[PDB]
Design a protein around this ligand. Structure first.
Ligand SMILES: *[C@@H]1O[C@H](CO)[C@@H](O[C@@H]2O[C@H](CO)[C@@H](O)[C@H](O)[C@H]2NC(C)=O)[C@H](O)[C@H]1NC(C)=O
Ligand SMILES: *[C@@H]1O[C@H](CO)[C@@H](O[C@@H]2O[C@H](CO)[C@@H](O)[C@H](O)[C@H]2NC(C)=O)[C@H](O)[C@H]1NC(C)=O
Ligand SMILES: *[C@@H]1O[C@H](CO)[C@@H](O)[C@H](O)[C@H]1NC(C)=O
Ligand SMILES: *[C@@H]1O[C@H](CO)[C@@H](O)[C@H](O)[C@H]1NC(C)=O
Ligand SMILES: [Zn+2]
Length: 696
């Protein structure tokens, strides 16, 4: 009773090579399941993180390279455009020969970069305003500085679009970095040195004199200013309650509450918002309803911006613009980022050009590339099997509601109701393959040049912003996918109440027809449960079956949810990460993903048990002395095998909403009674604490 096919052989070998059978499963299942993986898969010099997910993503890029690099005579226009874009990207000779000219020619559009201008006040100072400067960077390039403005879905009205105002992100990964001490020290130094080096490059190419000391003065002022702004932002821990974040008010009320003085003049919110929306010819009146996510931040901004000159402010705003473009220029400009990249990611060099280009084209033409990918690599027969798994796990969630004693009867009915309303998306949208006309029409306005990569990416930035801004008076398109198909990931959307599984994740170790059911349920099964559970985590539970931010919880059940979930806040917050120098996980910011992990694996296992009950036992795998209950948890863990560079471990522990794979494995299995039964773990072994957390 042992499988002998070539498929079972490499499946078994993969499992065997990744595990470390010398480790005790009940002491550390990560070391047990991924010990061999760690020795076998050294982090590539161009990778900041390496893992099962990252490996699959690298392998997907190879496929994209194959289907993008060679023109074919029968290529429809949409595909021709994708290949032209790719070709422009990988021609490094053409890029190198242009130096920094594409950026230098463009810089006036954002009111220049004062430190690298001959006479900034003379040339730009006369027509400059913060309203117009922030607006141009926003509406043309999607670069959000000082104040974030975006058109998105209305939290409380999921069919409508509405303007949002929020605090912006920073040049460094998080607000914590701006302490610039200890583990943040090198990053801050490299960040300012990065500014200075680029200022020198641009001035040299412009034929301007180089004053080393003067540049240093201006760029340290940039850092001084961004430090204050960072300190003014609200912590991520205080932004996980969607109900508290939602503040609807009129533009008039915004002007009233959030006045700002810049260069001695009052900031006009009407001017700012209309400088943005006029790009798509939409007027914004004072009665316009607006959603403000960060009122505290805007108030704290008041005494900060008065202290700085237009040169100071523009030096920061244009630097935020320039820092993300320098790697799209010649080698000299690429290399200016070296020390900065290493400080944040630990990587010694940028990844291969063709890899970046494949990813870039995928990111900007997800339907055209999704089409090429699925035709080359995706078995459509997979869809119906995944459909059935989703049905099983959805039903398991609903049945589990009876077991949960911390919910009253009517909250259970509402929860079941939302679970039933969840819509699924699997593989790819059929239209990208079956309807050439629609696909071509999507990219009608795009026209790329073979030898102008930088011009192409500028065109893409404008197009992307214009497309989103135009939605303000339009209803939300229900059928629109929230991801490309050539993606190794899965998603839950609160606003649409839907779960999405693109073709890219429907492969080993997650899922295969040539893979054991134990592995399939432990893999994509757990992921399906994960996404479903997201509809009921600390964020998702606030949205109803139609995607609206409304309270459908009784006071008692809501209180009980918070009590049950608090256990997981403490559990993961107590985890210390050696790769991050002993820093602790953020239990609050990772709560949602941890709730989904813990709920999902339990749902998946129960669904698997039900399957075995009705269909019988499976054939054992050769060379592996484990039953299929144990293979379920082994495959679950190997889905999350991986490691981090120290610099990026520090980065991710402050920015990633997920726990590191290491602790997703330890955390979820510590809370799993079924895991400890499968591996016969003694009570109070590290993997089997007698106190366990439970939400779903
Ligand atoms: C971060 O911002 C807070 C205010 O948002 C600053 O706290 C103020 O500090 C000054 C000077 O120490 C005091 O006079 C105020 O009373 C403080 N206000 C509050 C509300 O605490 C804080 O100093 C800033 N930190 C940094 C590093 O810039
Ligand atoms: C915008 O400003 C108004 C006016 O101060 C705020 O409304 C006041 O809120 C306080 C309590 O926070 C009440 O005591 C006042 O009666 C309210 N006044 C008015 C005219 O409504 C409002 O809360 C502010 N908005 C935000 C998001 O801070
Ligand atoms: C890259 O660009 C250079 C300069 O325009 C050109 O000579 C060369 O043929 C291009 N390479 C390809 C593969 O088209
Ligand atoms: C913003 O104000 C400037 C000067 O007051 C004006 O020229 C410009 O037209 C205004 N923008 C909009 C969108 O009205
Ligand atoms: Zn998730």
């Amino acid at each position: 009773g042992i499988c002998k096919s070539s498929d079972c052989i490499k499946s078994a070998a993969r499992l065997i090579q990744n595990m470390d059978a010398t480790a005790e499963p009940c002491t550390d299942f990560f070391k047990y399941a991924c010990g061999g993986w760690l020795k076998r898969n050294v982090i590539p010099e161009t990778s900041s993180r390496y893992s099962n997910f990252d490996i699959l993503r690298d392998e997907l890029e190879v496929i994209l390279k194959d289907v993008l690099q060679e023109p074919k005579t029968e290529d429809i226009v949409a595909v021709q455009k994708a290949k032209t874009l790719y070709r422009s990207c990988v021609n490094e000779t053409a890029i190198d020969s242009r130096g920094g000219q594409p950026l230098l020619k463009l810089l006036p559009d954002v009111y220049g970069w004062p430190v690298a201008t001959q006479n900034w006040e003379q040339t730009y100072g006369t027509s400059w305003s913060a309203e117009k400067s922030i607006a141009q960077l926003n509406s043309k390039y999607g670069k959000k500085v000082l104040i974030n403005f975006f058109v998105g879905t209305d939290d409380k009205n999921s069919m409508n679009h509405i303007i949002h105002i929020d605090q912006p992100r920073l040049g460094l990964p998080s607000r914590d970095y701006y302490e610039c001490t200890g583990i943040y020290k090198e990053a801050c130094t490299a960040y300012v040195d990065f500014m200075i080096a680029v200022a020198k490059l641009i001035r040299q190419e412009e034929g301007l004199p180089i004053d080393e000391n003067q540049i240093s003065v201006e760029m340290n002022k940039v850092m001084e200013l961004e430090k204050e702004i960072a300190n003014a932002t609200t912590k991520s821990e205080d932004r996980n309650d969607p109900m508290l974040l939602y503040n609807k008010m009129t533009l008039a009320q915004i002007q009233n509450n959030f006045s700002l003085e810049i260069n001695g003049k009052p900031f006009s919110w009407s001017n700012f918002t209309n400088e943005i929306m006029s790009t798509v010819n939409i007027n914004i009146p004072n009665e316009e309803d607006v959603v403000v996510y960060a009122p505290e931040y805007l108030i704290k901004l008041k005494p900060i911006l008065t202290k700085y000159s237009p040169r100071d402010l523009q030096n920061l705003m244009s630097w935020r613009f320039i820092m993300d473009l320098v790697s799209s220029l010649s080698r000299t400009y690429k290399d200016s980022r070296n020390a900065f990249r290493k400080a944040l990611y630990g990587t010694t060099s940028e990844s291969a050009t063709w890899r970046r280009c494949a990813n870039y084209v995928n990111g900007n033409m997800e339907n055209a590339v999704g089409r090429l990918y699925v035709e080359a690599a995706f078995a459509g027969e997979s869809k119906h099997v995944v459909e059935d798994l989703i049905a099983q796990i959805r039903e398991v969630f609903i049945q589990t509601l009876d077991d949960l004693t911390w919910m009253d009867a009517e909250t259970k009915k509402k929860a079941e109701e939302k679970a039933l309303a969840i819509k699924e998306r699997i593989g790819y949208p059929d239209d990208i393959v079956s309807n050439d006309n629609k696909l071509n029409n999507e990219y009608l306005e795009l026209n790329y040049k073979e030898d102008e990569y930088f011009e192409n990416i500028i065109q893409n930035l404008k197009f992307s912003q214009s497309k989103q801004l135009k939605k303000l008076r339009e209803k939300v398109d229900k059928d629109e996918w929230i991801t490309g198909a050539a993606i190794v990931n899965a998603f839950y959307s609160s606003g649409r109440n839907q779960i999405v599984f693109p073709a890219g994740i429907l492969q080993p170790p997650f899922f295969s027809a040539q893979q054991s059911n134990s592995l399939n349920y432990g893999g994509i099964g757990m992921v399906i449960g994960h996404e479903i559970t997201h509809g009921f985590d600390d964020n998702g539970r606030n949205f109803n079956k139609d995607g609206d931010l409304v309270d459908w919880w009784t006071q008692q059940s809501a209180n009980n949810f918070k009590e049950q979930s608090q256990c997981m806040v403490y559990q993961y917050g107590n985890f210390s990460w050696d790769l991050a120098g002993g820093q602790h996980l953020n239990g609050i910011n990772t709560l949602g993903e941890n709730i989904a992990d813990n709920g999902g694996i339990g749902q998946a296992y129960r669904a698997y048990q039900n399957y075995v009950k009705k269909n019988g036992e499976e054939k054992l795998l050769p060379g592996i002395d484990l039953n299929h209950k144990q293979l379920f948890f082994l495959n679950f863990a190997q889905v999350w095998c991986g490691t981090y560079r120290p610099e990026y471990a520090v980065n991710s522990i402050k920015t990633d909403v997920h726990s590191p794979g290491n602790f997703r494995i330890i955390g979820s299995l510590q809370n799993s009674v079924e895991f400890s039964e499968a591996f016969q773990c003694p009570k109070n072994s590290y993997m089997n604490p007698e106190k366990k957390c439970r939400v779903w």
